Write a protein that binds this ligand. Sequence first.
Ligand SMILES: C[C@]12CCc3c(ccc4cc(O)ccc34)[C@@H]1CCC2=O
Ligand SMILES: C[C@]12CCc3c(ccc4cc(O)ccc34)[C@@H]1CCC2=O
Lengths: 123, 123
Amino acid sequence: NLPTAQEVQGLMARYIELVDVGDIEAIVQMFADDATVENPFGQPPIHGREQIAAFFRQGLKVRACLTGPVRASHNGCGAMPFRVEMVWNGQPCALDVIDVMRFDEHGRIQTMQAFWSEVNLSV
Amino acid sequence: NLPTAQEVQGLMARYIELVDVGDIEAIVQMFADDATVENPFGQPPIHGREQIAAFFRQGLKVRACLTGPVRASHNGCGAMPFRVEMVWNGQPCALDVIDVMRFDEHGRIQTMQAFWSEVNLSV
Ligand SMILES: C[C@]12CCc3c(ccc4cc(O)ccc34)[C@@H]1CCC2=O
Ligand SMILES: C[C@]12CCc3c(ccc4cc(O)ccc34)[C@@H]1CCC2=O
């Protein structure tokens, strides 16, 4: 059912674990089948597991890690601070991001929003 | 006008500055007149500067500080990680919070959401 606050801290931390190791099939599986992702926030959202897998396959040398604890509410919502490290066109750089996800009655990410822009890109 | 990413990083950092010193009139002034605040997220929102002032007056020995950089988008939205320290009924404790605000065409906070629950309360 609708995850509890403590359950949310876990799912979201799990998500970063997966993104960090790059297990794409496992990552795509945490989302609801018809989920919508807005990354970065402001851009048109991607919808459904097919498009989400496509996105992650395209994006993931990349390590990620929580930079602070996971803030959670009681209606299945959470937000977390984390850093994404990579190597763009040979050049190494880091991006500071905050993710806001909403889970469904099955513990799957129903909607997710990523907050970040160039001002957070430290290259 | 709609603040730019860099402008958002500033307004939000300014906001924490004010909350940290407790200048209530200055804080209430950053919001639009008909703004809505959801603190914590999930609870019924408070609406308008009168209610917002009431909230802050009630809440603010309290120090606050950004615990990570401010993530910002290009459509006037931002999210930030920060810690709130206080002294509840004689006992000292800290709360980890992440705020998500949306600014209006005047640089005023139009809507604000605070993510946190007991799991972030370290007493
Ligand atoms: C796609 C990307 C790698 C992963 C990633 C980015 C931005 C926000 C994210 C939010 C997530 O929850 C998980 C992964 C990312 C980067 C933008 C530039 C890049 O290489
Ligand atoms: C009201 C409060 C002090 C301030 C505060 C809290 C929670 C989220 C916040 C978010 C803000 O953007 C600014 C101030 C607070 C605390 C909840 C318990 C408490 O004493």
